[PDB]
Design a protein around this ligand. Structure first.
Ligand SMILES: Nc1ncnc2c1ncn2[C@@H]1O[C@H](COP(=O)(O)OP(=O)(O)OP(O)(O)=S)[C@@H](O)[C@H]1O
Lengths: 183, 192
């Protein structure tokens, strides 16, 4: 039964001068645990999920907050990066890579992974270069954002568990994302 | 000096000069005396617009004290040859040749500002040499005077006899009188 004051006291030990940032995480963490705790068989149906966008100067401690949180957090946590992501199934990487990385921390537990938290770094790397809609395909940039839209709202993505043992299985495990939080 | 403006397009922002921006909208400026260089430049602009769009109206603003006849007659044939309707507007003044290009515009699309002024006279020339050579240049310039009156009557609708008497000497015509004379169609007082 964690509380914003208790969780903030723990985070305050590792971070200083980020009072505004800490409050946002405490509420989401407290609400997220509260949301999942609820059976959902009540008047409130399809409770909303508040995402988080951490913008700050260089070296201000953004990446550190996500790292310290996982130590105190019980539910699984994963820290990916949007540098390697490529849209349209290119050679670089796909967006599903984020989900399989979560299971590595969760030991391939679907019921326990949907309640996990996700973090992404260097999100500005995919912003358009202060231009109007492009005249060609931007694999890294405007294209990547289009793919993440449905993932943040909630959907099921194919993910080979453990990468797949051999040709025998040739299946993918559906992983809901409506409850997953994104930072 | 010429100021630069920015035209916003879907691809991006583009820097254009004030004269080139209006050229994109089928608008040409005729300023100063009509000479071989200024005339040959307008012809290329008219031809360029013909290929881009032959069905859109062209607007030609004229503010000039006139000039060489041969340079101006090349433009007159161009306006009549091409399919688009060349709308003409008189700003400030329109001399002998400037008036000829004004009336040569498309019927019903000729305008003159309320305070504009038109002036028309006969061709000017001269020669120095033997009497045999003077007679040749005199016969040639006389044909031009006759030819310029025939075309002036065609667009203005007046009779050749009337144009001959009014063009013997300088004749200034205000903007309202130009409408009554058939040279133009209306006046663009205000925007509607
Ligand atoms: N408030 C802080 N208290 C203590 N150490 C801090 C603090 N802020 C930053 N640091 C140090 O900065 C290191 C990296 O912090 P980051 O979270 O990476 O900062 P950053 O602005 O996120 O840099 P990016 O995200 O990679 S551009 C941490 O491992 C700490 O050693």
């Amino acid at each position: 039964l964690p509380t914003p004051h208790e969780i903030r006291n723990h985070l305050d030990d590792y971070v200083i001068g980020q009072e505004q940032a800490k409050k946002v995480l405490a509420v989401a963490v407290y609400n997220h645990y509260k949301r999942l705790r609820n059976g959902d068989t009540s008047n409130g149906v399809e409770l909303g999920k508040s995402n988080i966008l951490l913008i700050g100067p260089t070296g201000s401690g953004k990446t550190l907050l996500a790292e310290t949180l996982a130590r105190l957090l019980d539910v699984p946590f994963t820290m990916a990066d949007a540098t390697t992501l490529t849209e349209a199934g290119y050679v670089g990487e796909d967006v599903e890579n984020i989900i399989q990385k979560l299971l590595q921390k969760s030991d391939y537990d679907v019921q326990k992974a949907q309640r996990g938290i996700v973090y992404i770094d260097q999100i500005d790397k995919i912003s358009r270069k202060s231009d109007n809609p492009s005249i060609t395909r931007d694999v890294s940039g405007e294209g990547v954002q289009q793919a993440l839209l449905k993932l943040i709202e909630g959907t099921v993505a194919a993910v080979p568990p453990q990468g797949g043992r051999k040709h025998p299985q040739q299946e993918f495990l559906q992983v809901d994302t409506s409850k997953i939080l994104f930072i | 000096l010429v100021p630069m403006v920015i035209e916003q397009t879907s691809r991006g922002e583009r820097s254009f000069d004030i004269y080139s921006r209006l050229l994109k909208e089928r608008v040409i400026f005729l300023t100063g005396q009509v000479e071989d260089h200024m005339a040959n430049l307008i012809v290329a602009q008219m031809l360029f617009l013909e290929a881009e769009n032959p069905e859109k109206d062209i607007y030609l603003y004229i503010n000039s004290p006139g000039g060489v006849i041969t340079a101006g007659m090349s433009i007159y044939d161009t306006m009549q040859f091409i399919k688009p309707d060349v709308s003409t507007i008189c700003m400030g003044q329109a001399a002998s040749m400037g008036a000829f290009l004004l009336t040569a515009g498309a019927k019903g699309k000729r305008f003159c500002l309320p305070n504009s002024r038109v002036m028309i006279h006969q061709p000017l020339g001269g020669y120095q040499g033997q009497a045999t050579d003077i007679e040749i240049h005199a016969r040639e310039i006389l044909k031009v005077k006759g030819r310029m009156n025939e075309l002036m009557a065609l667009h203005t609708g007046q009779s050749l006899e009337q144009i001959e008497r009014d063009t013997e000497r300088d004749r200034f015509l205000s903007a309202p009188e130009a409408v009554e004379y058939g040279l133009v169609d209306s006046i663009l007082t205000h925007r509607n």
